[PDB]
Amino acid sequence: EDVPWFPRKISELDKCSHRVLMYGSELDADHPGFKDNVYRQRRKYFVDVAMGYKYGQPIPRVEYTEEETKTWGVVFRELSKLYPTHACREYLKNFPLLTKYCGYREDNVPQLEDVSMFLKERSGFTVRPVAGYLSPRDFLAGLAYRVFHCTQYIRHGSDPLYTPEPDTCHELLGHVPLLADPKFAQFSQEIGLASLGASDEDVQKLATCYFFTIEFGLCKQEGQLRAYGAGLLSSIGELKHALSDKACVKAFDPKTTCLQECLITTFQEAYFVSESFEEAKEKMRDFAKSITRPFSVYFNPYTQSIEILKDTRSIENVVQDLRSDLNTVCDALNKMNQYLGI
Amino acid sequence: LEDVPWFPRKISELDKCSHRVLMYELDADHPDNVYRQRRKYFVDVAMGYKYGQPIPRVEYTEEETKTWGVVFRELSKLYPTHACREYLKNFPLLTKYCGYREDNVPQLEDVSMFLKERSGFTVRPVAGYLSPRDFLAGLAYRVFHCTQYIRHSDPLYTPEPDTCHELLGHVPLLADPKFAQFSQEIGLASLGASDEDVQKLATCYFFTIEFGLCKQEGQLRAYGAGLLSSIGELKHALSDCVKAFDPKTTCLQECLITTFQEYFVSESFEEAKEKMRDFAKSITRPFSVYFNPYTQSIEILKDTRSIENVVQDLRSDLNTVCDALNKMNQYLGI
Amino acid sequence: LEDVPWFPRKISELDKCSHRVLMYELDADHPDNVYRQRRKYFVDVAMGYKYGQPIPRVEYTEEETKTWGVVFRELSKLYPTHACREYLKNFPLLTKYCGYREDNVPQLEDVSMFLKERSGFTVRPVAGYLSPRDFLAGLAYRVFHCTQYIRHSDPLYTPEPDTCHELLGHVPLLADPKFAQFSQEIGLASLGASDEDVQKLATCYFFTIEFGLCKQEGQLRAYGAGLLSSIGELKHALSDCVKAFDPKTTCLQECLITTFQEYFVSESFEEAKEKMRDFAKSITRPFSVYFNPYTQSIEILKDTRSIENVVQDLRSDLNTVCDALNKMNQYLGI
Amino acid sequence: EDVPWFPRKISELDKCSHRVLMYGSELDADHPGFKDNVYRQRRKYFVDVAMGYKYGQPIPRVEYTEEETKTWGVVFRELSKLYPTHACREYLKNFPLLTKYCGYREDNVPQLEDVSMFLKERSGFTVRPVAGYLSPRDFLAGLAYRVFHCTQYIRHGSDPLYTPEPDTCHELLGHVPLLADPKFAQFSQEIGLASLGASDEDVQKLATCYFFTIEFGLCKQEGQLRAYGAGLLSSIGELKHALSDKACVKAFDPKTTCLQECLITTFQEAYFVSESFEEAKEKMRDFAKSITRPFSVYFNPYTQSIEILKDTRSIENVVQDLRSDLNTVCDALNKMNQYLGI
């Protein structure tokens, strides 16, 4: 009972979403908009929209300004020039889909509500507007429910190519195309599940893993290095450098990787590569065993809650469930022999 | 290639099934023009519902509410004595969160949000009778189609499903995770099945859900929604025919709309469901179905790639079983 | 801690079960002193067998061989007509490799090496009657205890199991992988069970293996070893009582040694086996059993560590299922 | 049908065992016994014993000479002085067991028949006396059946501390203690299974994996490096060097490791470490997927034969089997709740 609290059902996740340690309206001293009073009005308007968000209510639509829509446009064209050659297969497949259904156009900033309904249909993810920085415990808790917290504001127009903080541009062009991949979604959820009720030290390690994978991971496809890290896909300078010849690149291993330090400003010392998200997801699930907690967690996608496996009765039902599902596999194999003679 | 009859492949596609109403409309026997005034309203509301928007709240007339209270009192009298354990465990919960009170009419939106948390079911207001293919399709998504109107004259007599039947008969059992698994199983079975097979499922559905009994503690108790709704019949099933629930044998038997059934018993819902899945293989269709609760869609198992993807998932879920067992040894040495 | 009745935990420990013979010895009704001369020899041989050494080869007398030929001809007459598919598929194989000929007596060593390859069974020459606990324990290891002697006077009449019964009744079915799984399942169930449960298993064993029927192609055919051995009874079971094989109901029924049974049918051995495992849970013992075919020993599932170890193994085996499916898509695009 | 032959049932493995490319009686030019005619008589006697071996016959017992028994003794004492500190947990646990049941004593050379019956009871392995070098295809084929081919001769007495070829001492002190571990046994069998019907190029890679794992693998236990490689456990010079501070040590990965060259004479450039044999076994099984062959293989321990998974009917039975076995898991969990209230 000395285990740190975690949300046990989807509606409880609101406590995590609203425990904002640092609000978006709080610009850092070296922020390009630190003395822009027009920009703080927008920043505090977005914080208000996010703070008002509650479970069971559609994600508010926001009317973006012209200098926010071009700043988006600027980031949109420069990165599109490097996606065919720098992005993973999963990105390049889902990105045209976003143009068709989520309004990914240079002249249009996508709405989170659109993106949420799109992700739910493709991989079961849904986005939440967040009013600022969360504890890594609270942020990762969202992942356990396949909920990604998104900033809804646009970076400053002074320098649209580089931002030290997350902005909607980063969320939409960096994270969302990959969250649309079912295999990637499972991988993200595994990190979340692992954090639930974990120690602060373990949460930080998971947060580190999140950083070097979700934000800055590379992946090897057909003998080539492509970026899937969202931070890479939203920073052209880093994106080009990551796949550059003079870069230190190491294989992704949860136990090794998690001990390294994360650099907010300078380019990272090393970038980690995963063969596949299924491959990375299983390395997370074996890392999750080493994490200290009195129980295991099962996620119930039907009730959108967390099952605690602390006895044989709940473990058996899970196993019984797996037995039924294996029966369906047999049915499928039967039908296939039945219809194709194989 | 789609020789097989169409079924919704995404939760959003289920709207097509709900609105395809064969019969909204009253018979001579049914009782009042003012009552008709309210019913057309109720139908209009059900027709106006589409996926993703909250189920409309309705201000009931006192006349509807008094009738609701009557059935509420009569049924409650014999629930400890004749209803299954699941009903009795879930009924007090309905009182605290869904406004289940003799003086009040519970709203579908309250009940829907209640069921989603308890078992992943959600209710839909329906505008009338649906084809058995369409009605069962909802079950595949754990969606129960509910009439939102009240029975007119005689409170105890009901010739058609009304919200009293839906709320007092179905909902307490829809709250049980295993019953939820069982109902969904029938729906999954129906998807893309021949009309012949679908009806056999409708019969199975009828005996099992509308009128099923299940032994617990060695004692005969009713779980049939029709039975919960109707007292005379409820008292009668327990009182001195009883047969074991076997889907293949049960489907053969007819349903009499007016007269009392010549009744099926299941040890458990886990039991029933298994007998259901084993029944589903005999059902003619080129594919098997897997349900994706994350995307709320139907996976079609027609190739090896889709089948493997399930198996890999199952491998992972088994790793979690292993993790649980390690931890359990870790903390209890057992 | 071992309150439960002892069972062999390693293949080598099974020697203790084989040699604990309750009754080696002939009744008044049984027929000849010269015959007794040979039988004591046969018992001496069975007693002399220990684990790991080849089953002794025996030079049969012509008298034993002529009798063997007689039963061989009579049974063969009705095998296409009354025996199951598995029997008929396996009998020609026995002719080519085990010396199954009207003029010859097959040796246990030939048959044993035959069964090991086909289904993992091996036969043991037994010195007499064993306790049902001991006899069924052999099945847990896929070991069938066989008498090595021949029936004396009347060839068709047999009051006790002899090698003719063992070779013509049991062996063709012991060669089928699924029947093998089913027989082992009964043995596993018995390990450490109460005497009460063991006997119920002995009854189940009797109706199923000694005297079971199974439908194939919609047609009634016999798989019961007793039936295969005895023609009069074999003809009679097919001819106009029949009941479905359910272990819990079947065990209740008695076995008449002399008279004809008042007979159980199984759709398949896979079917029967499942009903067996589901029966095994009700059997009182503090543990579950897992069989290790690599070390030929019994795993006792009493803690989480042993249970996990199985689950991890099962995870790996599922990976192989996945590999197969990939390759199948790889080569056939399916 | 253009797939290279592999044994499909246990009795067929004899073809592999007897396809000796180079007999033990054929001493290499720099062999210490190359001009020892007394030693060639023994070497050719052992070859004869091995050549006469057939399936279903007890492994012949051999009466060793006095200078073979001390040479054994010599190797036996020097290595025992380093096992507590250089060997893995699995080795140190099984080694005293070998002393009790297999006659592992300084004054006694163990018989293969003893060792075989011991291994069968503990992990399902059995040893075969081999008359010499086999093709890697033939050697690895044995592993698929959990059969290890063993030399039965003793190294030359001139220099008992170092041998460039396998001798009974190596088999008994290097391989057997680890083959007694069920987890290790599964790992060895996985390598074998992978080779069955594989291309020559893939077989060589598997043989390379065998080399750097079975013969020269290290393992990390409780934060320390211990050797489990059989070649390490039979060579004191290499054994000390492997755990020495100035050694290049890398993690065991099948895809990476398999491309490296194996050095017969000089100490290896790098040594590979596995967290556990279960851990290594699963890396083999994922490597096995990448191996090109028209089918997958299932090993039937009941009939001791290989199942070919080329259709849905055989795949389903496997899945059905797994469903029954999962039912037993449920039974076990039921009983545990039933008796312990958990």
Ligand SMILES: CCn1c(=O)[nH]c(=O)c2c1nc(Cc1cn3cc(C)sc3n1)n2Cc1ccc(-c2ccn(C)n2)cc1
């Ligand atoms: C596991 C680490 N991790 C955490 O522990 N907690 C998080 O809240 C978190 C996070 N990671 C990300 C996402 C993120 C972080 N980050 C940094 C970039 C440069 S781009 C980018 N996206 N977030 C979301 C987030 C939301 C807001 C802020 C932020 C910073 C300054 N302001 C005003 N707001 C920073 C991060």
Ligand SMILES: CCn1c(=O)[nH]c(=O)c2c1nc(Cc1cn3cc(C)sc3n1)n2Cc1ccc(-c2ccn(C)n2)cc1
């Ligand atoms: C599988 C059979 N099955 C079907 O094929 N299709 C269904 O639509 C269906 C159903 N079963 C039930 C639920 C139901 C039907 N029913 C009859 C009672 C008397 S109580 C009761 N509950 N429904 C829902 C439903 C909805 C509306 C009506 C109806 C009847 C007359 N009106 C004007 N409306 C009847 C049934």
Ligand SMILES: CCn1c(=O)[nH]c(=O)c2c1nc(Cc1cn3cc(C)sc3n1)n2Cc1ccc(-c2ccn(C)n2)cc1
């Ligand atoms: C589960 C019941 N069951 C048991 O409890 N214990 C068993 O030993 C057993 C058995 N069942 C069978 C096999 C068998 C028994 N039996 C009787 C026939 C008539 S045909 C036939 N086959 N055996 C093997 C066996 C071995 C020897 C004798 C026997 C009888 C008289 N003698 C001198 N020897 C009888 C049976």
Ligand SMILES: CCn1c(=O)[nH]c(=O)c2c1nc(Cc1cn3cc(C)sc3n1)n2Cc1ccc(-c2ccn(C)n2)cc1
């Ligand atoms: C997968 C590689 N691999 C192969 O492809 N094929 C194998 O036959 C093999 C093997 N690996 C090992 C076992 C072995 C190899 N080896 C080298 C040491 C130095 S110690 C030691 N043990 N063997 C068994 C073996 C048996 C005999 C000899 C041999 C060498 C010279 N003579 C006269 N005999 C060499 C190896």
Ligand SMILES: [Fe+3]
């Ligand atoms: Fe980010």
Ligand SMILES: [Fe+3]
């Ligand atoms: Fe109903």
Ligand SMILES: [Fe+3]
């Ligand atoms: Fe018998």
Ligand SMILES: [Fe+3]
């Ligand atoms: Fe070696």
